[PDB]
Design a protein around this nucleic acid. Sequence first.
RNA 1: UCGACA
DNA 2: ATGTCG
Length: 134
Amino acid sequence: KEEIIWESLSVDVGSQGNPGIVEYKGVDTKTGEVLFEREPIPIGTNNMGEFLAIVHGLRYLKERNSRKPIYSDSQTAIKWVKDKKAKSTLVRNEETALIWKLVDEAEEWLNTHTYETPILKWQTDKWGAIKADY
RNA sequence: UCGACA
DNA sequence: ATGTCG
Ligand SMILES: [Ca+2]
Ligand SMILES: [Ca+2]
């Protein structure tokens, strides 16, 4: 019955408002050790943050030759990564430039690299808050 | 239009 | 509010 794979990486987004200030980080699911944390972005959506978090985790694991899976509680982000396309509705303008810039580069990375990293759904309703929660 | 879920 | 799905 979906055992928690503790040998994995968990990521999550943190924000102040939605859309609003967004940041994300990845931790060791087992210990909670923070493996990476993104500098806050002035304005972005929760989902863009969830999305960027997985893609960065994907890059973090690849460059370290790790086959560990990644846990995300975002149904949306998980699909965006699966499709290699972040279907965000956030308006594109001077204010949202940076976030979209990161989202586009994330998509670009996905479309130019390969990986076998399993992207798993973290079940908050059963296991509590994802370990990388803010 | 109605809702379900993350 | 952001998103997917029927
Ligand atoms: Ca989350
Ligand atoms: Ca959270």
